[PDB]
Amino acid sequence: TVKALTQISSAGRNGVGAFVLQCKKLDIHYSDWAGSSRGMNGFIKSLLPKFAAANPQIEFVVSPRPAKHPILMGHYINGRTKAICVRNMEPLEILKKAELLRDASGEKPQKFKKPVTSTNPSVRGVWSPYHGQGMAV
Amino acid sequence: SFFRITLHRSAIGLPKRTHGVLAALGLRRRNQTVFHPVEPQFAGMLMKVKELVRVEEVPHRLTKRELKDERKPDAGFVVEKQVRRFIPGVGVQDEVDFSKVGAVVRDGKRAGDLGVRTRSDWEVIGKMKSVLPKVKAL
Amino acid sequence: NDRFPPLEPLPPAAESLPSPLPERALTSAKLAALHARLNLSPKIPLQTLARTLVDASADENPQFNNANLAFVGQTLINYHIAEWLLCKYPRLPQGILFSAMKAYAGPKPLLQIARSWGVDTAAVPGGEVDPGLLQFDALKPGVAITNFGYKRTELAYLEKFKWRRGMASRVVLDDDFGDVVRSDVSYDRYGNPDTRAAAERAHAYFVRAVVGAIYAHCGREAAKAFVKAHIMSRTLDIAKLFEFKYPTRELAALCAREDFEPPVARLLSETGRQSRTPVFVVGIYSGSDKLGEGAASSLDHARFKAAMNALKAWYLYSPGENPRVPSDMLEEGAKPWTPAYIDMGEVISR
Amino acid sequence: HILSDGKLTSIQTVANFMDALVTPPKPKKLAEQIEQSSILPELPNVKVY
Amino acid sequence: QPPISQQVKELLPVLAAQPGHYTTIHIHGKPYLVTEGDTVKLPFKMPGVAPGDVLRLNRASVIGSRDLTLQGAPYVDERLFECRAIVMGTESEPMRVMIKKKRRCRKKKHVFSKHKYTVLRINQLKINDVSSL
Amino acid sequence: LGQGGSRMLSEETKWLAVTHKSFDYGRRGYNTRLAFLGRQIIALETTRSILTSPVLNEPIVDKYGRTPYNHAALANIDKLIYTQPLDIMDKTKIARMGIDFGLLTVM
Ligand SMILES: [Mg+2]
């Protein structure tokens, strides 16, 4: 007799079959008064239009935020955010910072430990002393 | 021919005169390779540092670009599908599939010139309420 | 007021409507991003992708909601996943087959798929919310999608007096996963186990309606490709869905049915007998052929584990990792169809 | 329209006259400059507040 | 092109018939043992690639199954397998500070390092049919 | 299945698709897995039957006076408002077909 377990579900592998960019929204805040936003205002007029036209899967929201530095706040599918203050940055520095939020995921930064990350079982199995030619001391 | 000279050991604790011999050969760091013609003025330069370098007779001289390409490993990958992107200086480059090869880059001052879907392109799509998939396809 | 003019212009009757108007979908940046995030064909307008986000709990009209779109998509998802399991694992027991389907096209995975797309929900539905948000009211469970199951005349006794329900009948009476059929407002409260089921249900109907939208606009092949890209692409270990009862008897009944020699358990290796953590490696043979093997810290457990692994090997037989599906013949220009392997049925033992 | 003596001294052609009379003051706010742009207001995935 | 050996043309179908397969790809000479569906986090920022780009990997030293193992002398012939990856994005580490200091000297020099890493997803790893070659 | 149906299925499959799990304690195979797939197929063909049905009825009037999107592709799906597959795939109807074709004598 075989009883079925109904607590296990399938897991998604973003990239296999279909790809989905993790960055889903980009909040672009500026200031018409703060001098630290002179570069941000230029990024919104010179480079943001073409950058947004090339990333139609991201939602761009340009809203003023007077009395505050300019920030680039990205929202990710995992539910986290990443805000980068771009005060006193030139337009091309803003673009390089915006491409960082696009290419990035919401996951927290982690030190480099292992290149490969796998969930499927070993093709050759795991070693066992009871499945070889034995060992004589 | 030429002398292919490579610095194998260092001269840290060696006399100052030995450092000048290596400076005149052009050897500034370990395993650095230089090429010099086969002449007495260079042979005697090597007899002073023969305990530090490795010499070899070669027909021709290798260029700085050709000497560094013999240690370059194979990339191991080939970009066959590039998604739409925006190059700051050129413009917006449309998606290209090198597997079937067409990198067309469109620049302009209006959205229609960039080669992307605009709010107007979405409104005409919504008004085409008559188009219908063929019954066979369905 | 004068200092805070409205950001998105809306008529005064906006809040009165249950869902935003269709034309409003043409001014939402969330929709346009969602449409491109899924690489949907331009044949699917934004007004249609907006209709896939309105649950019947937010708009009771047969139109403007997910009811019909989700039903068509559910039939496509369930069909493509069913034929795919019977061609990859033609020996799966019926119970394991129901769980495998529910593990791919059930409310749990579809909830994860909808979240994998970056679809946020609206707090309370209304004509003022962004058309790019999933609209539903978790306080109203009186909405149910049409299915192909029937209500059992003994359902009242099934739940109260623990009456018996067989597996052979779940294919005709119960739903596609074996589940029986038919199993002012104040927001000063907390969640409930019912609101979670209503929310999980809303996300599922959305993913289904997207498939139904692709089918209505693009066609049949486009729908199969979408299902095959976001659903069948997921990973599931079916071996972990097995729960055996007396596996030593089921294996003896299997060998008897196929006319194999009676199964005999043999000790292939052992170490640590008379210790706290021994290792007995037992292998079950039918004559001279090794069927299964299991290693445990007890002689009985090692014998049961060996029989379970022998039964899994029988049920998890796969002709191939990417086998042909009978749906491939509908696509014109396909090679002739080769008959697939049809199993007799799971073993029934004492 | 009152034209400053600095504007008149710069005006040296009939085209400079029409320009100083027709071109309105440049909008100081960035949002006003954006709504006059030709790309950002047309992209479907962009919204400016 | 150099024809495949008869010993490989005879056993490759037996290699591709087994359930699971792994491969050891080489990116810039460094090996990575991966399988279909695995995620690779390279210790460097690959230039000229954005999330969504598809790469074709063509330097495999080992392509094997449980029992059989195909070995190439420098590498395996590209005609025997098809491995493809997709760029998932770019990750970063937390800023780490290295303090360079000697005893009995107050000057503590700081070194701030925050490196970026490109992430790939192996979305295809299949062995081709060589009955034609 | 009309003339030529006897040869359509294999010899062992003709008896399997016809045997129920209540026969001989399932010692000989039964048709529980084939029925699971057969329902998914009839459920899909019955749905396609309504979508492509060239029949149009009076639309629904919105209490709020709204007007639907009114797309043609969505008109085929709106046909499910009036005709549901379960209305056609009734147990009594399908069960009656088998009795007429003599399914009760060979099952
Ligand atoms: Mg010194």
Measured CA to CA, the distance from residue C135 to residue C206 in angstroms comes to 10
Q: DSSP of B38-104, one letter per residue? A: S-HHHHHHHHTSTTTEE--EESSPPPHHHHHTTSPPP--EEEEEE--EEETTTEEEPPEEGGG----
Which residue, chain included where needed, has tokens 């760091």? B29
Q: What's the gap in Å between the CA of B138 and the closest CA on chain F?
A: 8
Q: What's the gap in Å between the CA of B75 and the closest CA on chain C?
A: 29
E31 strand-pairing partners = E26
At A112, the amino acid letter reads F
C201 strand-pairing partners = none
Method: cryo-EM
**Is residue A36 classed exposed, middle or buried when 0-12, 13-18 and 19+ CB atoms within 10 A define those classes?**
middle
Give the tokens for residue C55. 């649950």
Residue C180 neighbours by CB distance under 10 Å = 17
Measured CA to CA, the distance from residue E96 to residue E28 in angstroms comes to 26
With contact defined as beta carbons under 8 Å apart, do B48 and B18 qualify? Answer: yes
- Whole-number Å distance, alpha carbon B51 to ligand 1 midpoint, is 21
To the nearest 10 degrees (0 to 180), the angle between helices C107-116 and C94-105 is 20
Main-chain phi, psi angles of C289, to 5 degrees: -95, 130
Residue C183 neighbours by CB distance under 10 Å = 9
Residue B29 neighbours by CB distance under 10 Å = 7
- Whole-number Å distance, alpha carbon C93 to ligand 1 midpoint, is 79
Distance from the Cα of residue C259 to its chain's centroid: 37
**Positive or negative: CA dihedral C20, C23, C26, C32:** positive
- Helix (H/G/I), strand (E/B), else coil: C232: coil
For C279, the closest chain A residue by CA position comes to A130
Measured CA to CA, the distance from residue C104 to residue D43 in angstroms comes to 36
- Whole-number Å distance, alpha carbon B18 to ligand 1 midpoint, is 14
Between the CA of residue C39 and those of C42, C43, E52, E110, what are the distances in Å?
Answer: 9, 11, 12, 47
With contact defined as beta carbons under 8 Å apart, do A59 and C29 qualify? Answer: yes
Helix and strand element counts for chain A (H, E): 3, 6
At D21, the amino acid letter reads L
- Whole-number Å distance, alpha carbon E112 to ligand 1 midpoint, is 28
**Is residue A127 classed exposed, middle or buried when 0-12, 13-18 and 19+ CB atoms within 10 A define those classes?**
exposed
Measured CA to CA, the distance from residue C14 to residue F66 in angstroms comes to 11
- Reported resolution in A? 2.7
**Is residue F24 classed exposed, middle or buried when 0-12, 13-18 and 19+ CB atoms within 10 A define those classes?**
exposed
Main-chain phi, psi angles of A22, to 5 degrees: -75, -35
Name every residue whose Cβ is closer than 8 Å to that of residue C231 and which is 6 or more positions away in sequence.
C77, C81, C104, C105, C109, C113
To the nearest 10 degrees (0 to 180), the angle between helices C193-217 and C67-88 is 90
With contact defined as beta carbons under 8 Å apart, do C137 and C58 qualify? Answer: yes
Measured CA to CA, the distance from residue E95 to residue E113 in angstroms comes to 6
Nearest to B88 by CA among C243, A98, C104: A98
Give the tokens for residue B132. 């219908």
Tell me which chain A residues have a C-beta less than 8 angstroms from the C-beta of B116: 53-54, 56
The 8-class DSSP code of residue D26 comes to P
- Whole-number Å distance, alpha carbon B53 to ligand 1 midpoint, is 22
With contact defined as beta carbons under 8 Å apart, do A77 and A24 qualify? Answer: yes
For C215, the closest chain B residue by CA position comes to B138
Residue E54 neighbours by CB distance under 10 Å = 22
At F4, the amino acid letter reads G
B85 strand-pairing partners = B93
Please give the angle made by the CA atoms of B24, B29 and B33, to the nearest 5 degrees.
70
CB-CB under 8 Å, D39 with B119: no
Measured CA to CA, the distance from residue C214 to residue B116 in angstroms comes to 22
Q: Are strands A59-64 and A23-30 parallel, antiparallel or unpaired?
A: parallel
CB-CB: which of F27, F37, F39 is closest to C148?
F39
Q: Where are the alpha helices (DSSP H) in chain C?
A: 29-37, 46-51, 67-88, 94-105, 107-116, 155-160, 193-217, 220-230, 247-257, 299-315
Measured CA to CA, the distance from residue C54 to residue C58 in angstroms comes to 6
Query: With an 8 Å Cβ cutoff, is D40 touching chain C?
Result: no
To the nearest 10 degrees (0 to 180), the angle between helices C67-88 and F32-51 is 150
Residue A50 neighbours by CB distance under 10 Å = 22
Q: Are strands E81-92 and C242-244 parallel, antiparallel or unpaired?
A: unpaired
- Whole-number Å distance, alpha carbon E97 to ligand 1 midpoint, is 28
Name every residue whose Cβ is closer than 8 Å to that of residue C152 and which is 6 or more positions away in sequence.
C158, C165, C173, C180, C181
Measured CA to CA, the distance from residue E107 to residue E102 in angstroms comes to 8
The 8-class DSSP code of residue F17 comes to T
A20 strand-pairing partners = none
CA atoms within 13 A on the CB side of E106: 0
With contact defined as beta carbons under 8 Å apart, do A47 and A62 qualify? Answer: no
CB-CB: which of A53, A55, A95 is closest to B114?
A53
Q: What's the gap in Å between the CA of C318 and the closest CA on chain E?
A: 9
Give the tokens for residue E5. 């050996």
Q: Please name the helix (run of DSSP H) or strand (run of DSSP E) that holds residue A29, with its range, or none.
A: strand A23-30
Please give the angle made by the CA atoms of F82, F88 and F94, to the nearest 5 degrees.
170
What is the length of chain C? 350
With contact defined as beta carbons under 8 Å apart, do B93 and B81 qualify? Answer: no
A82 strand-pairing partners = A74
Q: Residues 79..118 of B with a Cβ closer than 8 Å to C: which?
A: 117
Tell me which chain F residues have a C-beta less than 8 angstroms from the C-beta of B130: 72
Give the tokens for residue C81. 């996943």
**Is residue E1 classed exposed, middle or buried when 0-12, 13-18 and 19+ CB atoms within 10 A define those classes?**
exposed
Touching partners of B (3+ C-beta pairs < 8 Å): A, C, D, E, F
Where chain E is broken, by preceding residue (C–N > 2.5 Å)?
none
Q: DSSP of C149-209, one letter per residue? A: ----TTHHHHHHS-----STTTTTSS-TTSPPS-------S---HHHHHHHHHHHHHHHHH
Q: What's the gap in Å between the CA of E1 and the closest CA on chain C?
A: 30
Query: With an 8 Å Cβ cutoff, is E63 touching chain B?
Result: no
Between the CA of residue C10 and those of C5, C14, C24, C118, C123, what are the distances in Å?
Answer: 11, 6, 9, 26, 19
CB-CB: which of C63, C78, C147 is closest to F40?
C78
- Whole-number Å distance, alpha carbon C207 to ligand 1 midpoint, is 71
